[PDB]
Each structure stands twice: as C-alpha cells, then as structure tokens.
Amino acid sequence: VVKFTKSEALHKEALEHIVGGVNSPSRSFKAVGGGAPIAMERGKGAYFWDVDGNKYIDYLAAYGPIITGHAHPHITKAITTAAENGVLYGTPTALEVKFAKMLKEAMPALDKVRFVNSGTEAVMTTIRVARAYTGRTKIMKFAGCYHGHSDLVLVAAGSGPSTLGTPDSAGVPQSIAQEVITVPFNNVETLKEALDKWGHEVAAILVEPIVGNFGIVEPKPGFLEKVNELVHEAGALVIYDEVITAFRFMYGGAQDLLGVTPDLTALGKVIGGGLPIGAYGGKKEIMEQVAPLGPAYQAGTMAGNPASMASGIACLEVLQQEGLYEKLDELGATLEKGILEQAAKHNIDITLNRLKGALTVYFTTNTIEDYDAAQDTDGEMFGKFFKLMLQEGVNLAPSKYEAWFLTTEHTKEDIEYTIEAVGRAFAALADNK
Amino acid sequence: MVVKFTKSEALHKEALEHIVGGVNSPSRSFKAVGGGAPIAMERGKGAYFWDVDGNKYIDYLAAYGPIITGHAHPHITKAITTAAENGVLYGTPTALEVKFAKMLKEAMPALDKVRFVNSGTEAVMTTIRVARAYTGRTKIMKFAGCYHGHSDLVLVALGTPDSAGVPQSIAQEVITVPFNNVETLKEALDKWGHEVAAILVEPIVGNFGIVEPKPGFLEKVNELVHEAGALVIYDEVITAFRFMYGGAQDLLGVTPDLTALGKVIGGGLPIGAYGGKKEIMEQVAPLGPAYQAGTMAGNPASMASGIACLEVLQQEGLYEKLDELGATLEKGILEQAAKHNIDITLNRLKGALTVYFTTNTIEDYDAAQDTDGEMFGKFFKLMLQEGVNLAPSKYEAWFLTTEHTKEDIEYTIEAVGRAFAALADN
Numbered sequence: 001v002v003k004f005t006k007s008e009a010l011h012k013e014a015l016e017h018i019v020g021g022v023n024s025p026s027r028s029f030k031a032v033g034g035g036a037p038i039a040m041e042r043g044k045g046a047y048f049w050d051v052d053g054n055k056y057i058d059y060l061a062a063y064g065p066i067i068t069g070h071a072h073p074h075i076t077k078a079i080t081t082a083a084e085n086g087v088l089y090g091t092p093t094a095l096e097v098k099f100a101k102m103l104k105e106a107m108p109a110l111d112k113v114r115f116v117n118s119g120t121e122a123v124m125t126t127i128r129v130a131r132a133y134t135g136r137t138k139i140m141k142f143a144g145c146y147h148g149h150s151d152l153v154l155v156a157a158g159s160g161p162s163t164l165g166t167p168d169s170a171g172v173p174q175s176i177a178q179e180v181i182t183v184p185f186n187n188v189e190t191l192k193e194a195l196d197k198w199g200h201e202v203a204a205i206l207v208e209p210i211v212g213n214f215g216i217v218e219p220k221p222g223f224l225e226k227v228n229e230l231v232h233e234a235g236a237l238v239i240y241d242e243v244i245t246a247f248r249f250m251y252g253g254a255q256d257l258l259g260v261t262p263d264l265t266a267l268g269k270v271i272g273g274g275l276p277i278g279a280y281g282g283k284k285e286i287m288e289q290v291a292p293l294g295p296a297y298q299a300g301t302m303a304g305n306p307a308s309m310a311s312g313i314a315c316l317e318v319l320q321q322e323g324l325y326e327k328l329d330e331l332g333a334t335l336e337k338g339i340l341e342q343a344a345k346h347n348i349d350i351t352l353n354r355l356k357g358a359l360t361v362y363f364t365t366n367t368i369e370d371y372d373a374a375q376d377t378d379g380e381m382f383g384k385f386f387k388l389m390l391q392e393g394v395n396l397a398p399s400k401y402e403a404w405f406l407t408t409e410h411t412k413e414d415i416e417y418t419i420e421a422v423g424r425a426f427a428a429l430a431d432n433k
Numbered sequence: 434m435v436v437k438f439t440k441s442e443a444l445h446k447e448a449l450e451h452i453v454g455g456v457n458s459p460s461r462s463f464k465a466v467g468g469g470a471p472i473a474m475e476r477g478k479g480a481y482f483w484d485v486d487g488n489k490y491i492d493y494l495a496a497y498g499p500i501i502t503g504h505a506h507p508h509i510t511k512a513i514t515t516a517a518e519n520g521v522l523y524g525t526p527t528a529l530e531v532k533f534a535k536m537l538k539e540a541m542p543a544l545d546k547v548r549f550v551n552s553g554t555e556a557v558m559t560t561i562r563v564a565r566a567y568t569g570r571t572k573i574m575k576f577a578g579c580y581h582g583h584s585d586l587v588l589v590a591l592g593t594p595d596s597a598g599v600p601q602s603i604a605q606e607v608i609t610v611p612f613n614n615v616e617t618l619k620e621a622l623d624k625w626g627h628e629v630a631a632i633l634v635e636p637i638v639g640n641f642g643i644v645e646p647k648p649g650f651l652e653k654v655n656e657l658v659h660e661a662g663a664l665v666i667y668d669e670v671i672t673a674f675r676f677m678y679g680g681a682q683d684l685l686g687v688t689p690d691l692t693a694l695g696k697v698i699g700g701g702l703p704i705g706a707y708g709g710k711k712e713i714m715e716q717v718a719p720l721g722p723a724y725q726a727g728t729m730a731g732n733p734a735s736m737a738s739g740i741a742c743l744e745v746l747q748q749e750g751l752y753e754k755l756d757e758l759g760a761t762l763e764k765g766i767l768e769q770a771a772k773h774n775i776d777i778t779l780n781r782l783k784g785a786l787t788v789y790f791t792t793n794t795i796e797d798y799d800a801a802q803d804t805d806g807e808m809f810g811k812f813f814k815l816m817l818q819e820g821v822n823l824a825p826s827k828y829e830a831w832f833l834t835t836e837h838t839k840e841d842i843e844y845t846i847e848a849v850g851r852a853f854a855a856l857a858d859n
Contacts, residue, residue: 010528016546017534022526023549023731025718039527043520051528062524063728070520079517079734086477086504087513087701087738090496090824091461092441092448093473094485100451112450115457117552117703118727124584132598149726150558150584170722171562173571175602269728274522276551276703276729291459295597299583300552301497301696302703304457307513311521397524 002391004038006051011036026063032383032398038390043070045409048395056395057414061405063397064212064244065269067357068318069409075273078314079307087307095309102316103271103279106252109261113281114290115304119243119268120148122278123206125290125298126264127152129280130204130237132289132296138198140205140236142185144371146213147206147241147266155180162194185211185370186220191230199234207262209254212244214374214401215360216353224260237263237286243278244269247316248405249356250325273315275308318408328357328406331415335359335406338419346426351377357406361385374401381429388428392421436818438472440485445470460497465826466810472817477504479836482822490822491841495832497824498639498671499696502745503836509700512741513734521734529736536743537698537706540679543688547708548717549731553670553695554582556705557633559717559725560666560691561586563707564631566716566723568664572625574632576612578798580640581633581668612638612797613647619657626661634689636681639671641801641828642787643780651687664690664713670705671696674743675832676783677752700742702735745835755784755833758842762786762833765846773853784833788812801828808856815855819848 014021022028022037029037039051046069048056061067068075096115104110116122127139139152147153155165155177165180167173181198183190185208195202209224211217231238240262245254247270255261264282271277281287289296302308336354339361343350351362362368363378363385382400389396396404406415448455456462456471463469473485480503482490495501502509530549538544550556561573573586581587588596589607608625610617622629636651638644658665667689672681674697682688691709698704708714716723729735745751763781766788770777776792789795790805790812809827816823823831 007526010531011526014526014531014534017531017538019546019548019714019717020719022719023530024524024726024728025724026726027524027526028719030719037526040523040525041519041528043523048523048525060524062522065522065728070523071518076514076517079521080514083510083513084505085475088496088499089474089477089482090458090494091474091482092445092456092471094444094475096457097444097448097451100448104451112453114453118555118729120727121552121554121583128585128596128598130598131600137600137602149555149724151562152585154724169562169566169718169724170716171564171566173565173606175571175606179600179602272729274520274732275734276732287453289597290453292456292462292464293454297459297583297588297596299458299460300554301458301499302552302699305701305703307702395525 002054004036004052007039008036010039010051026399029398031379032386045069046407046414054393056393057418058395059404060395060397061407064405065272065274066405067248067270067407068315069407072318074318075311075314078310082307082310085306088302088305093306093309095306095313096304099309099313102313103281106316107246107256107265109255110265110281111284112287113279114298116278116280116298117276117300117302118148118278119266120150121300122243122266122268122280123147123153123241124150126239126266126280127204128298129286129289129296130239130264132294133286134203134235134237136201136203136236138179138181138201138203140181140183140194140202142207143182144214144374145185145206145208145211151176152180155182157182161190162197184372185217186223187370188223188226191227195230195234199236202234202236204237204239205231206239206241208244209240209242209258210245210355212358212403214371215362215368216355216358216403217368217370218355220369224258228260239264239266241266243267247271247319248358251319270315271312272308273311275311276302277308277312324408325356331406331410331412332357332359334412335415335418339422342419342423342426345423346430348426348429358403360403362400384429385425388425389421392424394418394421434818436488436820437486438470441473442470444473444485460826463825465806466813472822479503480834480838480841488820490820491845492822493831494822494824495834498832499699499701500832501675501697501834502700502742503834506745508745509738509741512737513702516734516737519733522729522732527733527736529733529740530731533736533740536740540743541673541683541692543682544692544708545711546714547706548725550705550707550725550727551703551729552582552705553693554584554705555727556670556693556695556707557582557587557668558584560693560707561631562725563713563716563723564664564666564691566721567713568630568662570628570630572606572608572629574608574610574621574629576634577609578641578801579612579635579638611799612644613650614797615650615653618654622657622661626663629661629663631664631666632658633666633668635671636667636669636685636687637672637782639830641798642789642795643782643785643830644795645782647796651685655687666691666693668693670694674698674746675785678746698739698742699735700738702738703729704735704739751835752783758833758837758839759784759786761839762842762845766849769846769850769853772850773857775853775856785830787830789827811856812852815852816848819851821845821848
C-alpha cells in the first residue's frame, strides 16, 4: 500500500491560500471521487516523484505539452542559457525569427505567425482576427470541444437544432453566449443545418481537427473536408485549434497529417518545450489584420520572450529526430493491445480510442465519436480505476475526458509494467461489482 | 551616425516576412516614434542591454514593467535553472504554488486567497468573470486610456470598441469614464450602477505614462462603487512590487475587492495571478461555478522564478534606494530641461517616471494624449544614440532596477542634456 500523507498535508495547507487548493479545476480530484490531489516534487523523463517519495510512470504529460519527457537535457540547456542572458526583453530578438521560421517550415500553411502567452490567448486572437477580416460577429464550434478559458469559448449549446448558445460558466453574460452556435463533432447534417440558418453571420468555426478534450476522438473520413467545404461556401473562415494536435502526432500539425488546410491555426502546449506559450498563424491576407499592420489588436508582455523561444526551438529540434513519431505509435499500439487484453480478461467494459502515442480508455461498450457519447460513459468506474492506478505507481489525468500521452522517454518496459498495473486495477474493479 | 543598427535592420527585414509587422507586440514597433526597424536585443545583464549590433545601452524599458531586479539577476537565474532540471511543467499541485501564494498574501494582506494564471491579461479577464458571477451583473466600468490587457472587453474605447474584431455586443457591456474625475464617475454610477458588476482601476496608472490618483480619489471610487452594489478590481499588473514590497493598495492604504497581478511577480517568466476577499473568490471552480483554468498556470518554473524575485525584493533598503535614485534622475532631467529651454512635465513615483513634452500637468488620458509625440520620437532616437534604451512611446514609463547605479543615472542625465540640446538646436 502506497501512502499520500505529505500530499494530504500539502493540500490542507493549499486550501487556505489557493481556491480549492488548485490553480486549475482539472487538477482537483473532484471528478474522481475527491480526496487530496497528489503533489509532484520532481519529474525526469517518463517518471514523476510525489512529495511522499512515491515514483510514477506518467501519462498526464501536463495535459498535452510534454512529449520529450520531463526535463529533457536539450531543453534544459536552452532554458539555462536563456536565463543567463535574460529571459524577457520587450524588444525583437533573433530567436523569435528563428522559431517563427521553424514553425513555418513544419506547417507550410502558416504564411505568417505571431506568438502569445497561451493557447487561450491564441484562440482568443484567431477569433478577433476572423471577425475583423470577415466583418462578421458569430462563431461556430463543436460540442464538448475545449478552446481555452476566454468568455466566448465558455459557452454551451443551444436548446434545439442550430440555436444560439447559453453560458457554460457563471460570469459569462448571455450577450456573449448569443454570439456562439454549437453543433456536434462528426455530424455533417447538423453542421449543414446551422450554416444554412446562420452561415451569413458566422465569422468562423473553431475546430479541434483531432479532438483531445473529450478523450482522443478522430474526425470521421470526409468530415474535415466537409467542414471546409460548407464553411467556405458560407463565407466564413476555418480556425484549427491545434493547441493539442500540433507536434503530437508527426512533426507538423493535424492539418499536415490529414491533408486539410484551415485559414487560421492556434498553437501552444507542445511548441513551448514546457514553458508558457501560444502562437497563431495562417493565410497572409488574414494575419495582416493584426496590429501594427492591421486594426485587430493583440499584444502580451511575455509574448515571444527569449526563454519560451529558446525552449520551443530546443523542443522542436528534439522532435526532428528520425523515427521518433513511429516509436510513439509502436509503443502506443503495444499499450492499446495490452489494455484491451486486460479488459477482456477481467470482463470490464471498455472502448479505446488511440492515435499514435495518445489514447483514452472509456468505460462503456459504445465507440466514442462525439461529446454526447463521451459524456454518457461511466465516470464512477473511471474514478475508481484512476485511484487504483495511482496505487500501482501510474499517474493519469483525473478525468474520463482526458488522454494518456506517451513521451519520447517511455520505454517498452514502462509500457509492459503499465499493462500489468492495468491488469491489477481491472481485477480489483471486477471484485467490487 | 556613430551608433549603427545595420544588423537590427537586416533582422527586421527578415522578421517582416514571418511575423506580422515583425513584432509580437505592437508596443515594440517603432511606429509611435517615427518608424524604422526596432532595435533587436541580443542579451541583457543587470541594468544593461546589448543589441545585435554589439551596442551597449542603459535600459529603462524593463520589458514594459516586469523587470526590477535587472536582467538575469543571479538569484532568479539559479531558480529557473533548478526548475528546468527538475521539470518545468507538471499539471499537478506542488509545494511551490503554496509557498508563493503565502508570500503574496504576506506582502498583500487583503488577498485572502489567490489563483495563478499565465498573463496579466488572463488575470484581468478572470477578475471580471468572477465579479460578474458574484454580483449577478454584466456591465464593467473603467477609466479612459487605461490598459487592462488584450481581451475583447478591455479593448473597447454603453460604450464603443477601438479594436477591430470586437463586436458591438461586447462594447454594450462597457462604460468608460475619465481617470481622476469624481463627477463623471458619480454620473455614470447614477445611471448604470445597478447593472455594473465592477469597476477596473489601475490604482496608479502606468499606461499613459505614470499618473497618480488625486488625493481621496481611490477612496471615493470605493465609496461610490460599493454603494452601487458593484465591486472594485485593482489591476495591479504593473504596480504590485514596483513601488514597495506590496501593492499600490498597501502603499496608498485603499483596499479593493479583487486584485489582478502579473509582470514583476514572475521574475521575468510568464505569469499572472488574482485574489481578494474570500467570499468573492469562492466563485472560482472547483469551489464555485466561475471557470478559470490554464495549462501553464502555477507551473514550477514560473513559481520558482516568482519566489526568487520576491526574495530579492525583500532586502532592506531596496525600495528606498530606487526612490532616491529616481529623485536624482528626475532632478537632473528637470535641470537639463531648464538649461536647454525644453518644455516638459515629469511625473515620478519612486523608481518609475514619465517625461512628457508639454507645459501641462498630466492627470488623465486626455492630457497625456495632447502631449507632443513628435518631440518624444526625436528625443527617443537621440537617446538611443547616447546608449540609453527607453520604451518607444510617449505613454511609457522609465523603470529603474535594483542594478542601476548612481553612475548609470549620472550618465543618463548627461545623455538627456545632449539630447535636449539637439532638440533645441532643431
């Protein structure tokens, strides 16, 4: 039996100074039955150590950014050098141009780019830019997809077919929600309906080209192609939110992987090497709306800072290695196979979506192709599974809507232990109900 | 002439092809000062910058506000390195978040609880959401010319926006009134007070130059706003830890309901935070229904960096020294203006100041906007030639750091005299 005594004490103290003891609700254990979240003291490659000295194989990847593992020495070197020369200037630098060019080389549809401080800021910006460019106000998005924590993307459907949004957070006015139309991911019919109905007032649609925010869910064949067709027909723009997808599945974005081109792209997470970052980019004429060139305002005190540029560069230099994404795919396939075998063995009902080195285990018999179905999977089962996995020394994200991410540092043996641990986790579930 | 920018010019030419307008903030373009390629910096150490052409500068930009320990202060550098070696981003709680949270609360006792985010802009937009959740109201009030980040609502000039791409539905939620003016404030709250969730205030303005609130003005803001049932948000993204070890609220002794923070408190790394009265903060998930998140929020690098920075700022005599040096600088600049017959007014608080080209006392945005931008731009470019790097706008502040010396100040004063001579010569 593992113990979490120090984490418990830390959480108790955290509650006094930080709202709910966490700086993101995602980090709370509320969704998985409560209790103190586990506090980590150190990460190295595939491993975490908590404040009680327990070791974990980590699949959280800090919710998407981590792919070179914790503290990869090539990135650490770059960060150290950056700190030694000052991490923040408020002026142009060579590194900004270098990193901009490297992103353009990997994702040839970016004609120009701008750096911001987060995926949230990147998305906020693409929206303002699409509105400035088209002269339109409304924004479309797919149900359940996450585009950061700005007011506009904190809106839900939509009572009835193709309707105006309702607020999905307190503090978000109906005046904001009124500008957003939400429709189901992977559904051509409803997309058609909404565009026929509102298409002429829609500045842009937001798309996770591959979904990572209600588990990993791939677009069906023809879907992204149809989004482009329908949205362009309507005079609207397509914004790919690639904050998760870019550099996660190949050296490049899902747009390069799947061969479908948006008008604008939002980036973040992986491209910072672990440091805070965002970027957006796309077709020349669209980007030229941004000040000082155009009238659309975007700024940010830490935007393009030398530390994040340096660590981002270092990270992509690592990801350039030949055979790297193929290894993630291989290990992912091994992991998928093993989890499915353990589920069959122990009569646990699961569905598993994997693309390369990212996967989600759902507790259900339904194949998950949209948010509605992910919502209806067994969160109570998932919660118990999550806590049993901790006991096995495997750190997952504490939500049924999260992905397991492999890194370049996970080994065959890491995966084989993980499978063993899942086997023991599933056995325990079987013995309780 | 003597100071050449060939390499900054070639780099800007390349940047233009890849980055919109060649900069990642419009602040960094030389657009406000007559145009041209901005100076690209290669490294910073203490009070000094070196550009890509090898030219050395005494820096007053402070990266528009966060820099106060100078560039690459060793105490911060070691923290950032240690953090990188131990992993910079976890996505779980850590002991460092709790430690830094306590330090902020210790410096600024009106924070019952705090949350970390990734930028001042995020901290500001969150305080608005929280204010709206708490009061159940939608309108936000702010002062003309003040800057609160680059989220839609605060980019509005009912009101009407000044950024393209910001819808009328947003502008209708914003009311804007002149800074330092009690009558227009009362008048706005009388009409719209019952729909106003909060007012946003830079308790000491930094964004149309440095401008202090008139005597009694902040207390009047609290008085009129609270009686309308609205909350007061201090946007202390610039002010906190700039003027004393604590916020403008601690310095001026006036307490808001919510506070947004950033810039200084990250030691240079990207950061924001917000906090305030316990009951209000209870709205934030997972405690309440007001959502706020952020993948790098509370990251161990930014936490360790912030802690290291506040540790430097705890040293006895540090803020006094910044004040004393600021006084010397102000005194020298005023003497040079008198000597060369240049019309300026100078607003200083502690180690931050703005030189305005005008004869008017500057107390609000309207006045600042009227000052002579042409003369500022010439002055700015003459200063570069003297090896002094300022922020390229008349709306900017000069910021001292712990690393600027009496000799740096003396040199800057003589640089200013040389530049004022050239302005007078014409």
